[PDB]
Amino acid sequence: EQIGKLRSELEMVSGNVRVMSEMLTELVPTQAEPADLELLQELNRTCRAMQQRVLELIPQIANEQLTEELLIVNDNLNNVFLRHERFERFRTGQT
């Protein structure tokens, strides 16, 4: 029950990762608009909240499948975080 529910949540989080990936690919780091970075920032904050959620579960989930999904989502959220950071650095010229 709860395992399937958590997996479903991770799928929704992966969806959010896909949204960020799309924006962080289609947009230009050096030409990113303040509004675009604001939207990315808010979504990044959500991803960070979901990252903490994952981190809480990893050690608490013995299930190999769900734990695998947790680790995968964690890595994806880290990629989104760092990619967003790159956007900020490139736009401000502090890379």
Swiss-Prot record:
Q: What is known of its domains?
A: The GAT domain and the VHS domain are required for the interaction with polyubiquitinated proteins. The VHS domain binds to phosphatidylinositol monophosphates. The KRKK motif within the VHS domain is required for binding to phosphatidylinositol monophosphates, with a preference for phosphatidylinositol 5-phosphate (PtdIns(5)P).
After translation, how is this protein modified? Monoubiquitinated.
Disease in which the protein is involved: Immunodeficiency 85: An autosomal dominant immunologic disorder characterized by early-onset autoimmunity and features of combined immunodeficiency such as hypogammaglobulinemia and abnormal T-cell function. Clinical manifestations include atopic eczema and recurrent respiratory infections in the first decade of life, autoimmune enteropathy, growth failure, autoimmune oligoarthritis, interstitial pneumonitis, and EBV viremia.
The free-text tissue note of the record is:
Widely expressed. Highly expressed in skeletal muscle, heart, placenta and liver.
Describe the task this protein carries out. Adapter protein that plays a role in the intracellular membrane trafficking of ubiquitinated proteins, thereby participating in autophagy, ubiquitination-dependent signaling and receptor recycling pathways. Acts as a MYO6/Myosin VI adapter protein that targets MYO6 to endocytic structures. Together with MYO6, required for autophagosomal delivery of endocytic cargo, the maturation of autophagosomes and their fusion with lysosomes. MYO6 links TOM1 with autophagy receptors, such as TAX1BP1; CALCOCO2/NDP52 and OPTN. Binds to polyubiquitinated proteins via its GAT domain.
The species this protein belongs to is Homo sapiens
Q: Which residues form the GAT domain?
A: 1-89
* Outcome following mutation: N16A: Reduced interaction with TOLLIP. Reduced localization to endosomal vesicles
**Effect in UniProt of substituting L71 to R/S:** Reduced interaction with UBC/ubiquitin
Q: What is the protein name for this chain? A: Target of Myb1 membrane trafficking protein
